Design a protein around this ligand. Structure first.
Ligand SMILES: COC(=O)C[C@@](O)(CCC(C)(C)O)C(=O)O[C@@H]1C(OC)=C[C@]23CCCN2CCc2cc4c(cc2[C@H]13)OCO4
Ligand SMILES: [Mg+2]
Ligand SMILES: [Mg+2]
Ligand SMILES: [Mg+2]
Ligand SMILES: [Mg+2]
Ligand SMILES: [Mg+2]
Ligand SMILES: [Mg+2]
Ligand SMILES: [Mg+2]
Ligand SMILES: [Mg+2]
Ligand SMILES: [Mg+2]
Ligand SMILES: [Mg+2]
Ligand SMILES: [Mg+2]
Ligand SMILES: [Mg+2]
Ligand SMILES: [Mg+2]
Ligand SMILES: [Mg+2]
Ligand SMILES: [Mg+2]
Ligand SMILES: [Mg+2]
Ligand SMILES: [Mg+2]
Ligand SMILES: [Mg+2]
Ligand SMILES: [Mg+2]
Ligand SMILES: [Mg+2]
Ligand SMILES: [Mg+2]
Ligand SMILES: [Mg+2]
Ligand SMILES: [Mg+2]
Ligand SMILES: [Mg+2]
Ligand SMILES: [Mg+2]
Ligand SMILES: [Mg+2]
Ligand SMILES: [Mg+2]
Ligand SMILES: [Mg+2]
Ligand SMILES: [Mg+2]
Ligand SMILES: [Mg+2]
Ligand SMILES: [Mg+2]
Ligand SMILES: [Mg+2]
Ligand SMILES: [Mg+2]
Ligand SMILES: [Mg+2]
Ligand SMILES: [Mg+2]
Ligand SMILES: [Mg+2]
Ligand SMILES: [Mg+2]
Ligand SMILES: [Mg+2]
Ligand SMILES: [Mg+2]
Ligand SMILES: [Mg+2]
Lengths: 124, 210, 124, 52, 147
RNA sequence: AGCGGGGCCUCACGAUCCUUCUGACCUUUUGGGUUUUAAGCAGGAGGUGUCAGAAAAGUUACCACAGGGAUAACUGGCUUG
RNA sequence: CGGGCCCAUACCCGGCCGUCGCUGGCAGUCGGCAGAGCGAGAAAGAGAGUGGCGCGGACGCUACGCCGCGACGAGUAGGAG
RNA sequence: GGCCACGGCGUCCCCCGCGAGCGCACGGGGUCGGCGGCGAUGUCGGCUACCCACCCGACCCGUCUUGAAACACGGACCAAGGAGUCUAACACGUGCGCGAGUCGGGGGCUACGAAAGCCGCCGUGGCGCAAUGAAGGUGAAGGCCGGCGGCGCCGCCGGCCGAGGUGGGAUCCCGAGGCCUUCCAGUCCGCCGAGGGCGCACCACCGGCCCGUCUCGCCCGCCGCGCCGGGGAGGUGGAGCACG
RNA sequence: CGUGAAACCGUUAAGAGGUAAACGGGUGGGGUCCGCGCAGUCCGCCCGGAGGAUUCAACCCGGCGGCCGGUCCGGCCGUGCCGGCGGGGCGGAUCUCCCGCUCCCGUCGGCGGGGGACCGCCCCCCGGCCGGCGACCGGCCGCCGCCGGGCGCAUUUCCACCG
RNA sequence: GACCCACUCCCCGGCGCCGGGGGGCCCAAGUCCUUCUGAUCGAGGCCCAGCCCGUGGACGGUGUGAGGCCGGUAGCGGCCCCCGGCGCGCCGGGCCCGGGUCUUCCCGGAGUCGGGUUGCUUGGGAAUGCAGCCCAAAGCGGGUGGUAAACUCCAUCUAAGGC
């Protein structure tokens, strides 16, 4: 996400600011020269950024470099990446609700017969 | 009574479970006792390997683990008679033996024979009457150097053959792995019925031709 | 640093007295003897301390040097002053102001000096 | 920080010998009293004997 | 820490947080999850659809070891070897392609989910998928089968 | 042109489990193969009328227990056919 | 029907207590190496350069701290600090 | 006669940028630069605590209950004891460490210490990184450029672009002009700003890909040319993918 | 027979007593105690009056300290880098001289292991720049400050009283 | 059985000699000076050897509160008794003991297996295990190969005797 959003046109050689954690991604091959400020960067992501040839800052260094945040790109990770959000919303067993149910295990015998089949009574 | 969205559970606590509750407060004491008995046995068997007899190379049984080797029960009688050691002498000199193990291929048999030969070249034998040496017995130069080793005698470690880069040939480039797998599956599934149909077809053939 | 050390010791120190809805700090070089970042006598690079002389007359003015932060034995230089009140006050005031030695607390220092001199003066 | 000074090795007489060593980075590692207290609280419970 | 719990704030209040009208009785709805068809029926329908009934066939003596099959994707494929190998392969001019053993790594089937860097390879897998094989070929390379 | 996948419209009817019939060059029947059998998948039917669907006769003046002034018999209160 | 008069915890003015909001203000204690300011209808510099004697200045800021403006204050079952 | 936030010269066109002092106060919340008495064995002060009187108010608590002071029940008085605990599972919310990984809990090696430290070819394993189908099984982008064959489409090809779009989006970017001390020009820094943009997270919508199923269809492959294997277009079912 | 509470009881002292006692708000009256109250606060500057000192400023010597040398000399350190005809430890699913095993009539060819090359990291010896010494300084010079001792001898400075 | 190779290193009944367990008795230093108290184990001091010991500063007792008053505590500290094993030579006793190849022979557990039915039991489902009754075996046989049955191939053990 960091590379995509920094390689978007117009926002060249700016500083990307994250108030979260910057994490290494393994299915990426080429890392551009990036300029990063974050609360913490994982060890392998730090190694990748430095070996590519960028710089990593802390927030005090960011405040010294640009007190007003001028020339910065403010990003954040996917807030709805957590698995709990697949359980929220319209309750299951209700028409047009693709909400994951709470089941102890996934399998043939676990909550698949009565409300889910058309042959076993009804399908919502 | 269920309340709102939850996951309905099945606790197996309907028996008299509080009567049988095995606590682990004596775990550190058990560890100390095990380690003390281990040291006692090791010091009792003075020069012999502390981890007992040597054990052979073994492939794990099922498809899930059949790519890994490990240590088995004992060497097999075919391996002993190919290595040259006697059934009743192997245990005396410190080699694990079991008469249950079969040998379905030559590779495992040869690997275990080579392992036995290495161990036999490796051990040092003492004269059971020190004032009188014997034929196959070692000399004082190594009798002085004999010492126990920790851990397993000859550790069983799985290694991977080193495979170097190659230029890809056009036959390899043009092979269809997915198609080959699908046709293999279909042939294995249809073999018996195809043989049957050919049988009855030849039956009508001979009926018309006789 | 001073701010980090303060964040460690602000509520979990052994010089801290918390009773009668009042808070006090009993470290040696603390003028006003109050639990405060400004008046703390341990966490700063440069502090002063006004203490009565063991002789029972005059005051002793303690200054913390610049070099030996991690060397406690040779960190504080003591100046014994046994003069009259006005000139003792003038000497302390010059030592602080002219040197520009942590000028946040010259008035507190001379208040403590006046109090100690009054105390050394015999009671009626 | 990255500035690591040199610490002298003191003799049995209380006075400094000529030897001196660099400050290991562990002393420059961050201080986190909250999690030190957390770890201390959770590890001081492991030597308790049961009662009932 | 019982000093932080709700029981310390309920000292003095008569009902201990359970109301005067409907007291805290013992089991006013039934033990466990009974009543799933009669008086908890609509809870079971609204949050556990499909909980009752039978479906599918039965297998008497199952073996997860028999059915064991781990999978890997082309996205993670190049991470199974040292990136020194990738650098050397993209640097050399003879054209020799590195060999990958997903079986050695601990995978059996290769699924093709994303991009593959344009660099010839040879993949030694037990099973392949059609799109994974197609993407490997489009990169330019071979898929071999192992047992 | 259109109209028609029941009755001019407002009613006329029934889940899980089990049984029965219909359908496929359908899947499994387990170390491999052939063949009966059995189990699956989809759609109908056999019915719960206490109709969101336990399998169910009385008596106690010999009686018991938990409760109810949420509920009768006696008194008191509103009303006055 | 007319003037006057009496008083509730209601309304008005004032003091004090707490809660809420302004997600308000304060690191500017920048002092002889000095020059005191950011409250006032209407955006943005106490901007920089180039040519035409006497040695003096209160308190403060446990920033989880201190300070200022307004509004608000019933409560069983129950929740939270 | 009475009143006024009227008060100099200089021309060009119209009609006809800093005076000095003082002092008074209906002026960003009280001061006196005003006074008087009484105090040693009987007086002074002590809103609270002890006793008494008077005026006003005032029914006995807990509890079920629409309704309790009740002619509803429990209660003579005092002291001590006395009731949401622990284990396991789950769900969400918060704090911490690491992070596409994470976890030694079992084992092993080295008074407090039954603690602590260590093991990595002890990570076996659990959870996560892939879903779907009852199952056999299958298993997560395309387009363009130029030609040959059976307009277009398919393959041999070679090369290139290459991992969605629309709308709203906190912040960021550019900048028509402007922020004065006599007046002119232009230089550097900073700030404000018409208008215009690259758009995080998320939301809605439209496309796309994977598995099951249905309909319409023609092409491709060969060690076994077959009740073989693979592919497309359009609907629909899923606890999926769409830079963790 | 440690300490010895409450309920309840006796006695002493005080007060009170025809709407059971008891209670909230506001006063008044009387008690037992407290203030060890009963001639009323002080703290700085200045004027005046009486007194007494080692006694002020300046100057000299010595010690210590704080800030510097636009760009003083010398050091150390880097979650800094560049050089290297340098010397090494660790790792690599990056390559390739010998030894052991087995397959052959001292041999072609296979397997395991040791040897070397390369790459990446780190430590050390040398050189050159950047930054820091405010988590991390030594000498010299300059200014300022403080302290001790002299010299200063009283229209200075300071002590205690009075109006 | 034949043909080759190899070997005089096993065990015990008794005797004599070589160095963990149970018990007993023991092993440092203030009652120093002054001063509190009914009583000190309290308080102050004991220098330039900051009273003395410390491999002993655990605990208990003694007229409160003791490292040095007593028992103890530390020590691979000491001494004195009894028992076992690991070794030693001796006397005697049992036994004169092996392996490779070729050839000839030998080779197994029954009212049990298995089948039908009944009852209990199991996660075991056209019957997992056990038991009763009836039937009741074979020897290229017999059991098992988690869906009943026939045919046909493989795989894998050798039940109904024992430590
Ligand atoms: C020791 O013997 C008792 O206790 C008496 C007794 O048994 C007797 C009556 C009965 C056998 C029928 O119950 C009882 O139950 O009396 C009840 C009673 O307690 C005294 C109160 C009641 C209620 C309010 C006034 N009323 C008084 C009498 C009464 C008379 C009745 C009647 C009900 C009552 C009840 O219904 C027909 O005439
Ligand atoms: Mg509830
Ligand atoms: Mg309440
Ligand atoms: Mg509650
Ligand atoms: Mg109740
Ligand atoms: Mg309830
Ligand atoms: Mg409950
Ligand atoms: Mg139609
Ligand atoms: Mg009709
Ligand atoms: Mg049912
Ligand atoms: Mg079968
Ligand atoms: Mg079969
Ligand atoms: Mg009768
Ligand atoms: Mg009633
Ligand atoms: Mg009546
Ligand atoms: Mg008001
Ligand atoms: Mg109000
Ligand atoms: Mg309220
Ligand atoms: Mg009244
Ligand atoms: Mg009353
Ligand atoms: Mg009640
Ligand atoms: Mg009622
Ligand atoms: Mg009541
Ligand atoms: Mg009544
Ligand atoms: Mg009653
Ligand atoms: Mg009742
Ligand atoms: Mg009663
Ligand atoms: Mg109590
Ligand atoms: Mg959660
Ligand atoms: Mg007593
Ligand atoms: Mg009395
Ligand atoms: Mg009386
Ligand atoms: Mg004692
Ligand atoms: Mg003493
Ligand atoms: Mg003592
Ligand atoms: Mg003692
Ligand atoms: Mg003694
Ligand atoms: Mg002793
Ligand atoms: Mg049962
Ligand atoms: Mg047997
Ligand atoms: Mg047996």
């Amino acid at each position: 996400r960091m590379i995509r959003k920094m390689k978007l046109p117009g926002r060249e050689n700016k500083t990307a600011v994250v108030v979260g954690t910057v994490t290494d991604d393994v299915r990426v091959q080429e890392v551009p020269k990036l300029k990063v400020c974050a609360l913490r960067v994982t060890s392998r992501a730090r190694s990748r950024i430095l070996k590519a040839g960028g710089k990593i800052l802390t927030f005090d260094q960011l405040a010294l470099d640009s007190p007003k945040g001028r020339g910065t790109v403010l990003l954040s990770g996917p807030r709805k990446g957590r698995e709990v959000y697949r359980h929220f919303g319209k309750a299951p067993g209700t028409p047009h609700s693709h909400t994951k149910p709470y089941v102890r295990s996934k399998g043939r015998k676990f909550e698949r017969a009565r409300g889910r089949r058309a042959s076993r009574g009804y399908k919502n | 009574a269920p309340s709102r969205n939850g996951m309905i559970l099945k606790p197996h606590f309907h028996k008299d479970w509080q009567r049988r509750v095995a606590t682990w407060f004596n775990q550190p004491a058990r560890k100390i006792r095990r380690r003390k008995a281990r040291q006692a046995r090791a010091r009792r068997i003075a020069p012999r390997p502390a981890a007992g007899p040597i054990r052979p190379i073994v492939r794990c049984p099922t498809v899930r683990y059949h790519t890994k080797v490990r240590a088995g029960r004992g060497f097999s009688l075919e391996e002993l008679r190919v290595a040259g050691i006697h059934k009743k002498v192997a245990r005396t000199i410190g080699i694990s033996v079991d008469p249950r193990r079969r040998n379905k291929s030559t590779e495992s048999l040869q690997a275990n024979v080579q392992r036995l030969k290495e161990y036999r070249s490796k051990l040092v034998l003492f004269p059971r009457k020190p004032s009188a040496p014997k034929k196959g017995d070692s000399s004082a130069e190594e009798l002085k150097l004999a010492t126990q080793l920790t851990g397993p005698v000859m550790p069983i470690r799985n290694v991977f053959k080193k495979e170097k880069a190659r230029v890809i040939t056009e036959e390899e480039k043009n092979f269809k792995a997915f198609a080959s797998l699908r046709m293999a599956r279909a042939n294995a599934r249809l073999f018996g019925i195809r043989a049957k149909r050919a049988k009855e077809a030849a039956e009508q053939d001979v009926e018309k031709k006789k | 640093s001073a701010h980090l050390q303060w964040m460690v010791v602000r509520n979990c120190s052994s010089f801290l007295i918390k009773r009668n809805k009042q808070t006090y700090s009993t470290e040696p070089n603390n003028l006003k003897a109050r639990n405060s970042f400004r008046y703390n006598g341990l966490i700063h690079r440069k502090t002063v301390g006004v203490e009565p002389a063991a002789d029972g007359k005059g005051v002793v003015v303690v200054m913390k040097r610049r070099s030996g932060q991690r060397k406690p034995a040779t960190s504080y230089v003591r100046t014994t002053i046994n003069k009259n009140a006005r000139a003792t006050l003038s000497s302390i005031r010059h030592m602080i102001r002219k040197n520009k030695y942590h000028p946040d607390l010259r008035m507190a220092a001379i208040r403590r000096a006046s109090a100690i001199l009054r105390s050394q003066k015999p009671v009626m | 920080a990255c500035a690591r000074p040199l610490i002298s090795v003191y003799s049995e007489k209380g006075e400094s010998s000529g030897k001196n060593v660099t400050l290991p980075a562990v002393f420059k590692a961050p201080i986190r009293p909250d999690i030190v207290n957390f770890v201390h609280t959770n590890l001081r419970k492991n030597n308790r004997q049961p009662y009932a | 820490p019982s000093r932080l719990r709700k029981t310390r704030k309920l000292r003095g209040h008569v009902s201990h947080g359970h109301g005067r009208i409907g007291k805290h009785r013992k089991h006013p709805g039934g033990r466990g999850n009974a009543g799933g068809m009669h008086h908890h029926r609509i809870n079971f329908d609204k949050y556990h659809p499909g909980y009752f009934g039978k479906v599918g066939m039965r297998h008497y003596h199952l073996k997860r070891n028999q059915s064991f099959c781990p999978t890997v994707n082309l996205d993670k494929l190049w991470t199974l070897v040292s990136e020194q190998t990738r650098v050397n392969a993209a640097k050399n001019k003879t054209g020799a392609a590195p060999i990958i053993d997903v079986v050695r790594s601990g995978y059996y089937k290769v699924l093709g989910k994303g991009k593959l860097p344009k660099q010839p390879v040879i993949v030694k897998a037990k099973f392949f998928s059609r799109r994974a094989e197609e993407k490997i070929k489009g990169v330019g390379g071979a898929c071999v089968l192992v047992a």
